[PDB]
Amino acid sequence: PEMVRGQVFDVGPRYTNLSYIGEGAYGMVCSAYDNLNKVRVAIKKISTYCQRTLREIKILLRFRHENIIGINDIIRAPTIEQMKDVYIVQDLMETDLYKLLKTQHLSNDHICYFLYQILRGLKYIHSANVLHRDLKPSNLLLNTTCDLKICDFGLARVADPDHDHTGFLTATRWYRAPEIMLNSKGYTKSIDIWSVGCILAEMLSNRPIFPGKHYLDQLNHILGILGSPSQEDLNCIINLKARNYLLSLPHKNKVPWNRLFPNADSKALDLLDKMLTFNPHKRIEVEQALAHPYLEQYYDPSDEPIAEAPFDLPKEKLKELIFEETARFQ
Ligand SMILES: Nc1nc2[nH]cnc2c(=S)[nH]1
């Protein structure tokens, strides 16, 4: 067994010369040489935590799309008794958008291209009636030619708008839609669109637009820029405790986008405005975002595929489910 930073990375004959890349969720990430098609790859070691592991495997194996990270191989023991670690193999990318925003100014041409590819991937995901629910810059991988792939489906769910309602004060904080702090479990597609709006804002300025320190700090940051919600938007919130909290706040005026981003393309600001809408019912959907004049140069519905079909247990059946789902790579 090759060892990496004091750890067993038992990835067999096929994958050699492992280099530490970092640690995402789940554990260690190394790159490795694949001797079957002579190209380096990324390998994640996996040791509840079982739930999100299973969820992701199940989704990523069903999805096939240029803008979604795939699964090339899965390595595990031949038997359930012997199975401890599971190794996930994926295409090696150069960087993620979070690391990129820390260090690099982006041209409008790059912002436009990135945003197109995010939406193109999201169009597919939503057509399968799946919510990602944790879109943020670190879950967006880029290769050396700026091709983009969405990763980490650990928090993903099937859409369920009939059961979205919940109480007041019930994923990553900065990219959370406002309705989540107010009356929503985040079971509708509109919460992903909000996260893309945040990512877009972050691409225009190299900084998180709403960096809340905590739950309600997040909300007052949003309202500090969007302004106090209208009576019509408030009427949509029927839970008295959410509504009366909002009514207890001082009046805030909308800060116009062109003041926050004085050198942004005006078309980008017009799309941003429609993504970061307080009322989820008024918020643009992904197909409409794709058709927006900002993305005209890329928009091509015949090259924007949709999925062919849309989508509580003891720890014993879960180990077993992971085993069964990973059998195809044996
Ligand atoms: N560079 C890099 N490439 C990847 N492919 C799948 N995951 C990764 C990560 S976390 N980093």
Curated annotation (Swiss-Prot):
Residues that bear Phosphoserine: S19, S228, S230, S266
A single GO molecular function term of this UniProt record: MAP kinase activity
Effect of L142A: Reduced affinity for DCC
Phosphothreonine modifications at: T170, T172
GO cellular component, one term: nucleus
Subcellular compartments: Cytoplasm, Cytoskeleton, Spindle; Nucleus; Cytoplasm, Cytoskeleton, Microtubule organizing center, Centrosome; Cytoplasm
Reactions catalysed according to its record: L-seryl-[protein] + ATP = O-phospho-L-seryl-[protein] + ADP + H(+); L-threonyl-[protein] + ATP = O-phospho-L-threonyl-[protein] + ADP + H(+)
UniProt activity-regulation remark: Both phosphorylations are required for activity. This phosphorylation causes dramatic conformational changes, which enable full activation and interaction of MAPK1/ERK2 with its substrates. Phosphorylation on Ser-19 by SGK1 results in its activation by enhancing its interaction with MAP2K1/MEK1 and MAP2K2/MEK2. Dephosphorylated and inactivated by DUSP1, DUSP3, DUSP6 and DUSP9. Inactivated by pyrimidylpyrrole inhibitors.
Highest taxon of the lineage: Eukaryota
PTM section of the record: Phosphorylated upon FLT3 and KIT signaling. Ligand-activated ALK induces tyrosine phosphorylation. Autophosphorylated on threonine and tyrosine residues in vitro, which correlates with a slow and low level of activation. Phosphorylation on Ser-19 by SGK1 results in its activation by enhancing its interaction with MAP2K1/MEK1 and MAP2K2/MEK2. ISGylated.
E.C. numbers: 2.7.11.24
Domain (Protein kinase) ranges: 15-295
Active site: D134
Record SMART domains: S_TKc
Cofactor (UniProt): Mg(2+)
Leading EC class: transferase
Domain notes: The TXY motif contains the threonine and tyrosine residues whose phosphorylation activates the MAP kinases.
Family according to the record: Belongs to the protein kinase superfamily. CMGC Ser/Thr protein kinase family. MAP kinase subfamily.
Name by which UniProt lists this protein: Mitogen-activated protein kinase 1
Species this protein is from: Rattus norvegicus
Gene designation per UniProt: Mapk1
